[PDB]
Design an enzyme around this catalytic site. Structure first.
Site, PDB file in Angstrom:
ATOM      1  N   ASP A 107       0.846  -1.167   0.000  1.00 14.23           N
ATOM      2  CA  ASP A 107       0.000   0.000   0.000  1.00 14.23           C
ATOM      3  C   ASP A 107       0.890   1.228   0.000  1.00 14.23           C
ATOM      4  OD1 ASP A 107      -2.576   1.434   0.441  1.00 14.23           O
ATOM      5  OD2 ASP A 107      -1.725   1.773   2.473  1.00 14.23           O
ATOM      6  N   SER A 108       0.278   2.400  -0.102  1.00 11.00           N
ATOM      7  CA  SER A 108       1.041   3.631   0.009  1.00 11.00           C
ATOM      8  C   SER A 108       1.477   3.931   1.441  1.00 11.00           C
ATOM      9  CB  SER A 108       0.220   4.791  -0.545  1.00 11.00           C
ATOM     10  OG  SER A 108      -1.030   4.875   0.112  1.00 11.00           O
TER      11      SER A 108
ATOM     12  N   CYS B  34      -3.863  -1.324  -1.657  1.00 11.42           N
ATOM     13  CA  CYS B  34      -4.237   0.032  -2.040  1.00 11.42           C
ATOM     14  C   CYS B  34      -5.260   0.012  -3.179  1.00 11.42           C
ATOM     15  CB  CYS B  34      -2.986   0.807  -2.491  1.00 11.42           C
ATOM     16  SG  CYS B  34      -3.269   2.516  -2.898  1.00 11.42           S
TER      17      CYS B  34
ATOM     18  N   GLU C 159      -6.760   9.388   9.346  1.00 10.45           N
ATOM     19  CA  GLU C 159      -5.434   9.392   9.947  1.00 10.45           C
ATOM     20  C   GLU C 159      -5.329  10.337  11.149  1.00 10.45           C
ATOM     21  OE1 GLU C 159      -2.273   9.713   7.018  1.00 10.45           O
ATOM     22  OE2 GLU C 159      -3.045   7.894   6.044  1.00 10.45           O
TER      23      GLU C 159
ATOM     24  N   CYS D 143     -11.423   2.580  -0.961  1.00  3.50           N
ATOM     25  CA  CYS D 143     -10.234   3.190  -0.356  1.00  3.50           C
ATOM     26  C   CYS D 143      -9.905   2.455   0.943  1.00  3.50           C
ATOM     27  CB  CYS D 143     -10.456   4.670  -0.103  1.00  3.50           C
ATOM     28  SG  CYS D 143      -9.046   5.519   0.638  1.00  3.50           S
TER      29      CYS D 143
ATOM     30  N   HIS E 176      -8.825   3.321   3.747  1.00  7.52           N
ATOM     31  CA  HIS E 176      -9.133   3.956   5.013  1.00  7.52           C
ATOM     32  C   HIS E 176     -10.631   3.923   5.339  1.00  7.52           C
ATOM     33  CE1 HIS E 176      -5.179   5.643   4.093  1.00  7.52           C
ATOM     34  NE2 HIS E 176      -5.150   6.320   5.235  1.00  7.52           N
TER      35      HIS E 176
HETATM   36  N1  LIG Z   1      -4.320   3.621   0.026  1.00 11.65           N
HETATM   37  C1  LIG Z   1      -4.972   4.644  -0.800  1.00 11.65           C
HETATM   38  C2  LIG Z   1      -5.352   5.849   0.051  1.00 11.65           C
HETATM   39  C3  LIG Z   1      -4.183   6.757   0.393  1.00 11.65           C
HETATM   40  C4  LIG Z   1      -3.462   7.301  -0.832  1.00 11.65           C
HETATM   41  O1  LIG Z   1      -4.028   8.208  -1.525  1.00 11.65           O
HETATM   42  O2  LIG Z   1      -2.340   6.803  -1.121  1.00 11.65           O
HETATM   43  C5  LIG Z   1      -6.219   4.046  -1.436  1.00 11.65           C
HETATM   44  O3  LIG Z   1      -6.654   2.964  -0.991  1.00 11.65           O
HETATM   45  O4  LIG Z   1      -6.782   4.619  -2.384  1.00 11.65           O
END
Ligand SMILES: N[C@H](CCC(=O)O)C(=O)O
Ligand SMILES: N[C@H](CCC(=O)O)C(=O)O
Ligand SMILES: N[C@H](CCC(=O)O)C(=O)O
Ligand SMILES: N[C@H](CCC(=O)O)C(=O)O
Ligand SMILES: [Cl-]
Ligand SMILES: [Cl-]
Ligand SMILES: [Cl-]
Ligand SMILES: [Cl-]
Ligand SMILES: [Cl-]
Ligand SMILES: [Cl-]
Ligand SMILES: [Cl-]
Ligand SMILES: [Cl-]
Lengths: 256, 256, 256, 256
Positions: free
Chosen positions: B11-12, B74, B144, B175, B177
């Site tokens: 993931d990011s 992600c 976050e 997403c 989150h």
């Molecule tokens: N993990 C990203 C969210 C955070 C980002 O923009 O990197 C997503 O699921 O889209």
């Protein structure tokens, strides 16, 4: 020294357009090159040493374009890279930390708000004694989503600012985006003087450049925009913050 | 070939720990390698082709570590890089787009929320017809910052979800989150089935891996974390989202 | 200003040790940081604008180490990056083009040998009028293989230098490696004065630094080696060129 | 799944055109994308792990162009990246190590020459027992300077091959450039069978793709040249090696 040359301004993205606007108001005949590092925005949650290297490579790019001065419009990149960048380069280099810290020194109780990187850096204590300092991460996205006059903004301002000293006489808006939130911030901290990074730096740039004979009285004022991410994405976000972006070009992170 | 080898998850940043958690619950004996690209977070505002190159880079790194499978936790990177990455690689590759799109096909009117990159990618329309799609940028930082259960979250959900069709039957939470925001989203979109990317993907991964003989029956489950940014900054944020990060080390972007 | 601070010297690799040795012979009290960019050696066949960006990156790194001056030991990087790098930076910046071009103006008919990048840059003609210029690509690998006294060196020298004008009075050895080839080149061009970049630059650095009051009058100099590639590979290749590398460490290109 | 798709071939630069020429001789109907990483040539002196990462990057780039197969024409990149690259990718991947090593198994005493990276890598020993191995760094620039038929070539060959075991039966020419040196090598090593990487690999590619049903039976395939450095520099080196390059595009290292 060539007064015909442009002034470089750089930031992580659109937020630094608050600094550019304040500069253009004072210096309507200067040519500006505004550099927004939108491929690597935001800076506020990165390691300070990483942001310092970004500032070095963007400064070199601006020098290869011929600028006669550099303004670090970003409070995070200023915190990471000044004073050293100004000490290391021959052209005048200006940032957004010192001018507001200098103004703050005429108050007894001073606060700072900014990104995580900015508040953790120690950059502001070098120049002014701080009674209180608070990272406010949600402020930037709230502004970029256009919600500065929405009660969500007042509620988020309360969440960050409630526990500030009743003491406080002044608060440094130590982030490019925070001038958009003067309404909400002031509603939550009545009485406290709000120190605007863009206006106080624009003043210092115009003064110092006049002092050195570097201004161009015969110029035609214009701005060119250079970004590392997508130009149309930048242009759309800039419009949401009230800036008409006329000429924009994408610069390769390879050109750096 | 080797079921003793770890499962790669990337993931990011910390957001993908929701996928990691769902996976660990269904597969408590597996070894996981979780890769968070915190030096380049967030992906949602980057060009999709840039995110696609990140994913290639990180997949290669995970293969050099010996993983037997790769999960793209992600939603933005899944949108950018799948299905091509799964077609191009021999090891099983899983993302968070298709399982939730599949489940959505059992509804007459489906919505999607995600990052700008995700909604503008068209990845989801490839698997399911969408009645409505909407980028919700402020949701990630709201989560976050720990505010998912506060009044502000309900107001922000209302801001993004107000113009949603009255006749929506399901909403893809597209997403990492957004599982944190089920309360606020449900309150504003009562009656709408909320499809969780983490759980639907973890179900698919557990199924397919058992089906290929790639599960490790007698292992002692554990997780190693790898991040491109500062490891202590990441450990702090992961705890704010309820993950205890024990073993973490920084991977140089040069290592990629 | 602090005279106990080190002098920075940079090159693409081991060739630049010719300049470091001359410098250290004249300046035995100075501390040197020698930076060899062996991850990206050689420079001579790269685009000049790419080498220029390397030079900017490496100068920034050296400045972050606290140097009081920078020597560009590489003739290719000097050709790409000077004079602009010296104009743009506050510390004294020295290269290997100007001192030999200056010495060359005391002759009627001057030649230049160097890398492709150096001869095609036009950096030397800015300072001295040239009758003949030739790129000599095999010279560098001949030296690194330790063959400067072998008959192959004479045959390759002949291959490159035979068509030089017979009225030539001086030849600029416009490459870090070429002092090792003085014997062979002199054999093939008897009576032509060979202008050595290392010796003439060292002379200028010592001259200029003394005039600025930047030399350390006390104490005993040391050298620290910093490379971007494998340190044991560097140490092996330096040993063939007659330097016993005491202290070496790898700097990540990400530190740049 | 589509035999009109191109075959990707990659190398550090012009050397790999020996492999390309051998392929095109056997496969006049196929479209080729020849990728020359001239921004980062040469590979033979770099860390093997660095070259392995380059190979991954370029492979992903070629997969984004739609190739149906990948040929690693470079012996250094084959040594660094195979067999893992073939195992990790779905499309057929071929290198220049295995076919010559296979042919060498029909001899009792086998030697290897190549770059430093290739010889150090241990790639060949995993396929064939070697009696002798020697890195020959000067061979590549000798060939690129066009001196392969000259007396100096014979003397360099003698310098490297002098100490070779007198009972050698075969020598693997384990570098893209070395087919140009068969005259000088064979003059110095009479009676030794010289195994040509380009011809033995092209043979294997044609056989394997035919057996896989991936050849285009109606094609009139062209060649496209893609390079990371300057196209004109590449064109001029190719001409020194006897290839007329017409269609060449610069690919940004940022596209990787
Ligand atoms: N993990 C990203 C969210 C955070 C980002 O923009 O990197 C997503 O699921 O889209
Ligand atoms: N420009 C940054 C805010 C946005 C960012 O984090 O990059 C600042 O002034 O601190
Ligand atoms: N140091 C280079 C020679 C080696 C290279 O090409 O990088 C020069 O002096 O031109
Ligand atoms: N192509 C390389 C030779 C040139 C280089 O070192 O990159 C090989 O076959 O090993
Ligand atoms: Cl960096
Ligand atoms: Cl922040
Ligand atoms: Cl977004
Ligand atoms: Cl559907
Ligand atoms: Cl609230
Ligand atoms: Cl050269
Ligand atoms: Cl080599
Ligand atoms: Cl062609």
């Amino acid at each position: 020294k060539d007064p015909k040359a442009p002034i470089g301004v750089f930031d992580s993205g659109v937020g630094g357009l608050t600094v550019l606007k304040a500069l253009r108001r004072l210096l309507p005949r200067e040519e500006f090159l505004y550099f927004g590092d939108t491929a690597r925005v935001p800076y506020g949650g990165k390691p300070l040493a990483m942001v310092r290297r970004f500032a070095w490579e963007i400064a070199g790019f601006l020098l290869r374009q011929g600028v006669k001065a550099i303004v670090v419009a970003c409070n995070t990149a200023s915190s990471a890279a000044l004073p050293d960048l100004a000490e290391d380069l021959s052209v005048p280099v200006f940032g957004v930390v010192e001018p507001a810290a200098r103004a703050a020194r005429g108050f007894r109780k001073v606060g700072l708000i900014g990104t995580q990187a900015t508040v953790e850096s120690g950059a502001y204590p070098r120049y002014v004694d701080l009674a209180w300092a608070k990272a406010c991460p949600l402020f930037v996205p709230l502004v970029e989503e256009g919600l500065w006059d929405d009660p969500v903004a007042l509620l988020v301002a309360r969440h960050y600012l409630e526990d500030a000293p009743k003491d406080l006489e002044a608060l440094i808006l130590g982030c490019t985006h925070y001038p958009f939130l003067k309404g909400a911030i002031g509603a939550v901290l009545p009485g406290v003087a709000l120190l605007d990074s863009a206006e106080l730096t624009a003043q210092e740039v115009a003064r110092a450049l006049e002092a050195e004979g570097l201004l161009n009285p015969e110029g035609r004022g214009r701005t060119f925009h250079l970004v590392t991410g997508d130009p149309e994405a930048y242009r759309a976000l800039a419009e949401r913050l009230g800036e008409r972006v006329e000429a924009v070009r994408r610069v390769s992170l390879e050109e750096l």
